[model samples]
Target chain A: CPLMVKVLDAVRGSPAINVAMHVFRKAADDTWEPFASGKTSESGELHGLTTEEEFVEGIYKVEIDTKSYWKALGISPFHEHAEVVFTANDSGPRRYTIAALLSPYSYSTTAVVTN
Target chain B: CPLMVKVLDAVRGSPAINVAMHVFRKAADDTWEPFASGKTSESGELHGLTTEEEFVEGIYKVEIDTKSYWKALGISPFHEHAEVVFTANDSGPRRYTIAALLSPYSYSTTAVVTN
Candidate 1:
């Protein structure tokens, strides 16, 4: 399966616009090794982040630089950084959207395996 | 409702001894306000951390200093810091165990509402 990550500005009900993101896969040794890095587009989406790598079943982590985005917009975010982890599966080449709901005071994230 | 947090060493299936933790609650404006801070005991638990404050329904964040405990044990952890965000509800003043499954390479957290 391919991995995609999307960030949204929950307050505005729109894409999180221009947020920096980094992705890591939990290695067998249990350390998070950076596998892909990129930023959200104007639509607040980053797709095919792990298209180059062989998809496997394991834990994945995504680190969002919420502070930078909030700082640019002159809004103070709740936390300096937000990181989320979830188990990824090779469910027959489907796409997974690891969505993040970003707000100034709180954020919630979840993973969805979709088309 | 009182809030409790516990840390456990996933590798050993025991409590994560002597771990430092800090708790924050989301304010009305969406900023995290520190409400309590403490360390785990030999049994790797911190109970009644928010007993002094009025329990509110909102997002709660827990920051765990995993690196310190791993370092003290001469084991390098996968992450220097681990943070978890979860919604806390006032379920009739029952205790909530915000438990962390800590390993050298990965960690998972969940909040369990209990009696």
Candidate 2:
């Protein structure tokens, strides 16, 4: 199976908030699996985790818990949701670094599989 | 001594090119040192390095070799250069993760000191 993963972050210049991310794998019947999870740090980087000597292969969807994050700053956005989709493919089992580039107001996702 | 580092990546919807980054620490009044460096991977992430029991603190500037990257894609921008400034602070010696959130045409930098 193709490994699925995602990187997430709040946008820079954002007001403020406590944000978390979830990765869900698309199932055969359009359902989802709780593949992995990560949360944004104080600096807005929510680095994901990888199992030892195991490279997860699959397509996955990611969702961000934006309400909690924005609520911290006493700011509410009309658009209170966002996410990113990406894949992780490497030759062997290794730790892949996935991260979110975000601020209290904005965010982004990016992923990298080690060589 | 204070440490300097930077994260670099090509904009997500960029053409194509090979890009590299440079970290020059402010030495004394004006001179600089080659503190650390990283190159962007295929996915556009240029994750920096961190030494064991080492945390780079203080404000630092980052410079990216955009010319080389743009040259690779055979596309150039009116503004052919860019950089980022950030600080890394933590309580003790630990490995901190720094990343470059970028696409082929755009980029952003963020730093995190481990707990």
Identify the leading candidate in terms of DockQ: 2
The lowest-lDDT stretch of 10 consecutive residues in candidate 2 chain A is A1-10
For each candidate, C-alpha RMSD in Å?
13.2, 6.8
Candidate 1 lDDT, tens digit per residue, A1-115? 3877777775654578788988889998999999888999877898767762676678888899998988999898779889988777665445665667678988766554434
Q: Which ten-residue region of model 1 chain B has the weakest summed lDDT?
A: B88-97
Number of residue pairs clashing in candidate 1, backbone atoms closer than 3 angstroms, sequence gap of 3 or more or interchain: 2
Show pairs that collide, candidate 1: A30-B105, A105-B30
In angstroms, the error of model 2 at B60 is 6.8
Provide a comma-separated list of chain B TM-scores, one per candidate.
Answer: 0.84, 0.60
DockQ of structure 1:
0.02
TM-scores of all predicted structures: 0.47, 0.55
Q: Please report how far candidate 2 places residue B66 from its true position, in Å.
A: 1.7
Which is the leading candidate under lDDT? 1
